A paper describes a structure:
The E3 ubiquitin ligase HERC2 has been linked to neurological diseases and cancer, however it remains a poorly characterized human protein. The HERC2 gene encodes a large, 4834 residue protein that in addition to the ZZ domain contains three RCC1-like domains (RLDs), a cytochrome b5-like motif (Cyt b5), a mind-bomb/HERC2 (M-H) domain, a CPH domain, a DOC domain (HERC2DOC), and the carboxy-terminal catalytic E3 ubiquitin ligase HECT domain. The selectivity of ubiquitination relies on E3, which recognizes a specific degradation signal in the substrate and accelerates the transfer of Ub from E2 to a lysine residue of this substrate. Our findings suggest a role of cytosolic HERC2 in the ubiquitin-dependent degradation pathways.
Author numbering: 2774 to 2914
């Protein structure tokens, strides 16, 4: 029913992909430890979601931990589009060293089939990042 909110990940997300440590990716959903930790090139990490076409993003957030030192994300770019070849920047977020819950998207009025969370920088220029979970709430249309 249009307008009602959703919090069941599997009813909103068709697929979840990550740039590295693919075997750990499911930790982003339930938020358990040890969390997803990238194993790739500095500033090139990403998480990509495909969203079912009757779901708008009501809330999208990520959980970080200041105790992670140089694994803590510090600069994140969120993009969305109708294909992975059509991603446009939606928001650039500068994370502060003491942040824990990081808002990424809210109250989207446009449908995004693909959403990308790109970790462009980590605290103290760490190479890899740790993200302790994603929070997704959807609105049916």
């Amino acid at each position: 029913q249009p307008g009602m909110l959703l919090d069941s990940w599997s009813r909103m997300v068709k697929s979840l992909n990550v740039s590295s440590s693919v075997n750990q990716a499911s930790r982003l959903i339930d938020g358990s430890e040890p969390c997803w930790q990238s194993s790739g090139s500095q500033g090139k990490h990403w998480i990509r979601l495909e969203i079912f076409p009757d779901v708008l993003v009501h809330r999208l957030k990520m959980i970080v931990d200041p105790a992670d030192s140089s694994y803590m994300p510090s600069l994140v770019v969120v993009s969305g589009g109708n294909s992975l070849n059509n991603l446009i920047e939606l928001k650039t977020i500068n994370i502060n060293p003491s942040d824990t819950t990081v808002p990424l998207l809210n109250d989207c009025t446009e449908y995004h089939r693909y959403i990308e969370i790109a970790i462009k920088q980590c605290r103290s220029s760490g190479i890899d990042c740790k993200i302790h979970g994603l929070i997704l709430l959807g609105r049916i249309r």
